[PDB]
Write a protein that binds this ligand. Structure first.
Ligand SMILES: [Cl-]
Ligand SMILES: [Cl-]
Ligand SMILES: [Cl-]
Ligand SMILES: [Cl-]
Ligand SMILES: [Cl-]
Ligand SMILES: [Cl-]
Ligand SMILES: [Cl-]
Lengths: 468, 9
């Protein structure tokens, strides 16, 4: 991805986006109880913790584009992955407006708490001023869609979230795009059935984990990925995507039955128009993280990429024996024979991708079930029921999270969520977590689950059939 | 996979 044109918003009539410059994250009541090194990401140029130029850092992931045609390797990769998706019978029929907006099986209701994007943010019009959970009203939305139309600019925000000491110092804060409510809606109508099918079918057929429930999904992963594991990381995946990968994504959707006109929304994601504060700019390539379906599309593209690299490096590869599960850039895969990921990384580099060893490793080492992580979680077989696998979020991560809050009024939900993550670390670690939480008065005002209850409910969850 | 007792996190 690359920035192709920048201008002062006022020269083109756009008002300045008044995006918050102060973090909503504050130290929580548990900040002193637990240890941690993460702090809120830098959100403004003047941050005294900066040790690099902010604006440069944030836009630096737009490393450029490789200007290539869709090659032979890509074509076979698309064909192989389209073959899997075909077995899913994804309907390319538009999703009915109400289903797209207010919720349906496999596609949660449009989040009414996130930004409505442009022009709404400039007019003080919030999603809630247009939409109604209670009434499922669509009259106002339609007025809005007709009045303002589609293909509106995206609003660029700096993601307000915890980051490592090093990422704070380097101003390496993440940018997310707020698609206009009009474009979000039109995209959910166009691809909603694909979103639903993906959400209902995490695994090796969609090659996606988007929308999965790790508590349940983890036990399936080693059944699905039964060869020698393959895993590696990308650096700035989203912004590194060149247009060629979107071209591949468009071919893939066409094989699925989408018309050329329907894939036009992919051009909207690729060659994009943004507002960042007082600037207005155009980008060619790069997935604009935050728009409708970005995790799904990123995941689909990853399926094309990895197959492409294997086909390129290993001419004798048999893709029918390759398996992978992606969540955007995050991947866990397997092949029955050992595969040299450093080789795949060099191939990727020729395609404008930056792949590094898994988990900040120095060498493309062997990935084992002991060291493998996915969605930041390790895999640990239950001691009593070996076929059940615990998703293990490191206690360090749980500690980082508990020390800060964006709204202390949600302490109960926040802590409960962390408890659902923590117990997988074991009874001793859990009792210690709980003891430390209760070492401050707020901790004793909370309804915290008992370990035995967590374990029991986890074991019972595997009893209830799940719709696919 | 590894079991918790055999491997920690
Ligand atoms: Cl601690
Ligand atoms: Cl944010
Ligand atoms: Cl799941
Ligand atoms: Cl990162
Ligand atoms: Cl080969
Ligand atoms: Cl059971
Ligand atoms: Cl299931």
């Amino acid at each position: 991805g690359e920035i192709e044109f920048i201008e002062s918003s006022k020269d083109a009539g756009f008002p300045v986006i008044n995006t918050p410059s102060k973090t909503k994250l504050e130290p929580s009541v548990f900040h002193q109880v637990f240890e941690g090194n993460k702090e809120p990401a830098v959100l403004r140029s003047g941050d005294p913790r900066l040790k690099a130029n902010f604006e440069e850092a944030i836009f630096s992931k737009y490393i450029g584009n490789v200007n290539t045609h869709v090659d032979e390797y890509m074509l076979e990769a698309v064909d192989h992955y389209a073959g899997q998706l075909a077995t899913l019978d994804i309907s390319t029929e538009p999703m009915k407006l109400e289903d797209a907006v207010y919720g349906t099986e496999g596609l949660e209701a449009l989040d009414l708490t996130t930004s409505a994007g442009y022009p709404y943010v400039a007019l003080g019009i919030k999603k809630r001023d247009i939409l109604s959970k209670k009434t499922k009203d669509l009259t106002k939305l339609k007025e809005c869609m007709d009045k303002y139309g589609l293909n509106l600019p995206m609003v660029t925000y700096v993601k307000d979230e915890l980051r490592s000491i090093e990422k704070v110092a380097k101003g390496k804060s993440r940018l997310i795009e707020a698609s206009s409510l009009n474009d979000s809606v039109a995209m959910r109508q166009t691809f909603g059935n694909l979103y639903k099918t993906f959400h209902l079918n995490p695994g090796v057929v969609t090659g996606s984990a988007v929308g999965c429930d790790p508590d349940l999904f983890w036990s399936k992963i080693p059944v699905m990925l039964d060869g020698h594991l393959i895993a590696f990381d990308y650096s700035g995946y989203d912004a590194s995507l060149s247009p060629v990968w979107f071209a591949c994504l468009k071919m893939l959707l066409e094989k699925l039955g989408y018309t050329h006109k329907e894939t036009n929304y992919i051009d909207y994601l690729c060659n994009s128009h943004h507002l960042y504060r007082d600037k207005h700019y155009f980008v060619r390539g790069g997935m604009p993280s935050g728009c409708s379906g970005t995790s799904i599309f990123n995941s689909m593209i990853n399926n094309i990429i990895i197959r492409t690299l294997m086909l390129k490096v290993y001419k004798g590869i048999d893709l029918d024996q390759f398996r992978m599960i992606a969540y955007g850039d995050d991947v866990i895969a397997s092949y029955p024979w050992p595969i040299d990921a450093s080789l795949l990384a060099e191939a990727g580099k020729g395609y404008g991708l930056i792949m590094t060893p898994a988990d900040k490793g120095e060498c493309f080492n062997e990935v084992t079930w002991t060291n493998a992580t996915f969605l930041k979680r390790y895999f640990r077989a239950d001691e009593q029921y070996p076929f059940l696998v615990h998703p293990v979020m490191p206690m360090k991560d749980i500690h980082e999270s508990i020390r800060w809050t964006k709204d202390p009024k949600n302490t109960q939900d926040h802590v409960r969520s962390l408890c659902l993550l923590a117990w997988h670390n074991g009874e001793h670690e859990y009792e210690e977590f709980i003891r430390k939480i209760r070492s401050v008065p707020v901790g004793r005002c909370l309804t915290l689950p008992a370990f035995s209850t967590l374990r029991r409910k986890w074991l019972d969850s595997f009893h209830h059939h799940h719709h696919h | 996979p590894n079991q918790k007792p055999r491997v920690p996190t």
